[PDB]
Ligand binder design. Structure first.
Ligand SMILES: Nc1ncnc2c1ncn2[C@@H]1O[C@H](COP(=O)(O)OP(=O)(O)OP(=O)(O)O)[C@@H](O)[C@H]1O
Ligand SMILES: Nc1ncnc2c1ncn2[C@@H]1O[C@H](COP(=O)(O)OP(=O)(O)OP(=O)(O)O)[C@@H](O)[C@H]1O
Ligand SMILES: Cn1c(=O)c2c(ncn2C)n(C)c1=O
Ligand SMILES: [Ca+2]
Ligand SMILES: [Zn+2]
Ligand SMILES: [Zn+2]
Lengths: 422, 107, 145, 48
């Protein structure tokens, strides 16, 4: 049980451990700033033993990553497995989806749980270990008592539900944050092998400073728009590659003066990558990094081609991409501000407004220090759970009955107490 | 609670008012410990409940992790949600927050 | 004290041009708009430094055979391979470039690593000059709005 | 302006009836009511 006592030390101290791991990664890439071609080796504008401290801190950082994944596995994984078990247990009772409704081959995340029905610890975290016989006696009349009830059903090695444990890992692995921390551990391991790409732990400045997190959410908000627009740009570039191939290949010499061993780029499989690497990030369109007409036959067609490339790439489409990203930022900051607005001019529950609770001075703040003050519904619900059944009042039995009924009319819609009276 | 209930339900009466002024020192101890919410208890009007807050439950609710779970929840609900299903999302939050609260007690 | 230390040396007695801000009451709003969004702007500039540092790691570990400021290289050729050097190179040159990095660097002309080179070039162009400079500009103009 | 018109279409397709043109809030004193107010009441396919 001293193992469990040491296990308490982790999850009590998770966030500070993660922040300190970020601090270690800063220090290591600060050291790794000093490299030099020779095989690579580091000088020292520092103490004499900086390379042994690098040898220290690599192991130290990998220790902290393993430390924090143990802490996270025994911190929040029970909550996630709880939410999953609760959702599945409600969908056995109120739906019978493995009994009647039969979810399709679509939604494998909802279809993973077919091999956890007959597991014996399906109510691990559900406070209700009698779901089995409950759905049996609610349904097994019709679909066979025997089939339905059968479908529900080294010593420590011989006292653990193995299939349930497999299912548990199967729900562990699909999680975002667990996948992130496992990736982070494996990158600390493969920087412990080769410390060249041990610098990939700079990504945590995003995941963990909570405004850069909005910045990095703003790269994937408008996914289908941005991908389709970039594909559109590739189509325009390809079409101009067709024109430049079929009519203007005599303007392609990277070489100096052409008597030097001149190189062209009028090919369909080359001219394309030329306009991509050169013409897209050019800024001058294409007329910088190309031959210019000086009295040719095709001079006017050339200038038309140049101006249309300039307009329909550098003027418009780069501004489209920029405007799409800055539009995503505007909407994200607007959602942040709207959250912090309607957290201050409305009650979350009675939903009335600020102004009505301001005829009385200081009133809205009292209207959420006394009246609704969302923590108290949490507390009162704990109070109802923890008392015995037999000592409920009329209102307490009423609310308990509604909550067992799941019908939700006792929450006030637009009817605070002060509205009722004069 | 009973003096509180007489005060809140029946204000403007000087006799109870004087008596509560002579009863001031007890409420000031127990004002953190009683809570009071609003419901409609089948009477088709607004009733008021009073109840008890356990000390350890509150004082281990408000600190550690549950503040961030709260933020997450408030963010997700105020940003988006159907107008009637919001309260069921709140009860789902309340349920697993109670489970998390016991688990944070378990440390 | 600045008028005193311009009375000593009148070279930097020109620092009293700052009062056009503090005293014309719209430029005051302009100069308040440089410090309104402090923690956002500092964190974003730090993010840009992290991206530049990561590309410095890649360019160090795979592409240092493209670094010659010198003419033709038979002249006493200079590289920018050192971690501390390549970093300040991308800062001074690549950030304010406009063409990303593909202007002020060697270009591939049929190498092994040509395709990886163009991928590196385009990703530098996008994730610095397209996005992040526009982020800084938009943050300042948002503060003005 | 084009994206604003798209979003305004998909807004006033969800806070108004197209016909009685009242609003969302009035059909929400009853829970789930506006969705019933266009699953039973007007539900434009039925005029067709
Ligand atoms: N129904 C409601 N429940 C809770 N708060 C409400 C409600 N209606 C309005 N408010 C306001 O929202 C604010 C909630 O404060 P907040 O959620 O920031 O708690 P906190 O402890 O200050 O910080 P945290 O967000 O970390 O919990 C309060 O200032 C209150 O005035
Ligand atoms: N008068 C109305 N007629 C139809 N729908 C209305 C009306 N008023 C409000 N609505 C809302 O507009 C939505 C109409 O749905 P929609 O037009 O998207 O049909 P759909 O079958 O979901 O998709 P599609 O747009 O391809 O028909 C409904 O969700 C309904 O709530
Ligand atoms: C025993 N029990 C319950 O009965 C319960 C609950 N949450 C809701 N209920 C109803 N929790 C967390 C609980 O432990
Ligand atoms: Ca009783
Ligand atoms: Zn309320
Ligand atoms: Zn209508």
């Amino acid at each position: 049980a001293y193992q469990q006592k040491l296990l308490n030390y982790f999850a009590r101290n998770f966030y500070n451990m993660r922040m300190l791991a970020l601090f270690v990664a800063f220090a290591i890439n600060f050291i790794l700033l000093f490299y030099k071609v020779s095989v690579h080796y580091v000088l020292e504008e520092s103490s004499g033993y900086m390379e042994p401290t690098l040898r220290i801190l690599a192991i130290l950082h990998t220790v902290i990553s393993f430390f924090c994944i143990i802490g996270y596995y025994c911190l929040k994984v029970p909550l996630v497995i709880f939410k999953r078990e609760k959702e599945v247990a409600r969908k056995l009772e109120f739906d019978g989806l493995y009994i009647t409704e039969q979810p399709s081959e679509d939604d494998i995340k909802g279809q993973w749980d077919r091999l956890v029905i007959n597991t014996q610890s399906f109510p691990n975290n559900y406070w209700d270990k009698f779901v089995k016989r409950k759905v049996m006696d609610k349904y097994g009349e019709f679909y066979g008592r025997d089939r339905i009830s059968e479908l529900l059903g080294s010593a420590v090695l011989n006292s653990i539900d193995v299939k349930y444990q497999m299912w548990k890992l199967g729900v562990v692995f699909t999680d975002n944050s667990f996948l992130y921390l496992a990736w982070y551990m494996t990158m600390s391991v493969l920087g412990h092998y080769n410390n060249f790409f041990f610098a990939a732990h700079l990504l945590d400045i995003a995941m963990g400073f909570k405004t850069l997190r909005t910045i990095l959410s703003s790269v994937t908000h408008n996914g289908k728009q941005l991908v389709l627009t970039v594909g559109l740009l590739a189509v325009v570039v390809y079409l101009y590659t067709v024109v430049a191939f079929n009519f203007f290949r005599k303007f392609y010499n990277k070489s100096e003066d052409g008597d030097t061993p001149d190189m062209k780029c009028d090919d369909m499989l080359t001219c394309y990558m030329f306009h991509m690497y050169v013409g897209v990030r050019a800024g001058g369109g294409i007329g910088d990094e190309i031959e210019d007409p000086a009295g040719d036959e095709y001079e006017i067609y050339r200038i038309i081609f140049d101006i249309t490339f300039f307009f329909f790439v550098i003027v418009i489409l780069l501004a489209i991409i920029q405007g799409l990203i800055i539009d995503a930022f505007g909407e994200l900051r607007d959602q942040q501000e709207q959250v912090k607005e309607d957290m201050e001019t409305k009650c979350f529950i009675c939903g009335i407004g600020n102004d009505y609770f301001d005829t009385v001075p200081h009133g809205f703040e009292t209207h959420t220090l006394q009246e609704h003050n969302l923590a108290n519904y949490l507390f009162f619900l704990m109070y109802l759970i923890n008392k015995d059944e037999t000592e409920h009042t009329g209102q307490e039995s009423y609310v308990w009955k509604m909550y067992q009924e799941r019908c939700w009319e006792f929450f006030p819609a637009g009817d605070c107490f002060r509205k009722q009276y004069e | 609670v009973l003096l509180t209930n007489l005060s809140e339900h029946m204000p403007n009466d000087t006799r109870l008012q004087t008596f509560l002024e002579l009863a001031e020192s007890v409420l000031n101890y127990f004002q953190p410990f009683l809570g009071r919410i609003e419901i409609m208890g089948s009477a088709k009007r607004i009733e008021r409940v009073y109840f008890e807050i356990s000390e350890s439950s509150r004082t281990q609710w408000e600190k550690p992790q549950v503040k961030e779970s709260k933020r997450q929840f408030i963010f997700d609900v105020v940003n988006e949600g159907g107008e009637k299903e919001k309260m069921e999302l709140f009860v789902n939050f309340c349920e697993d927050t109670i489970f998390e609260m016991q688990l944070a007690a378990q440390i």
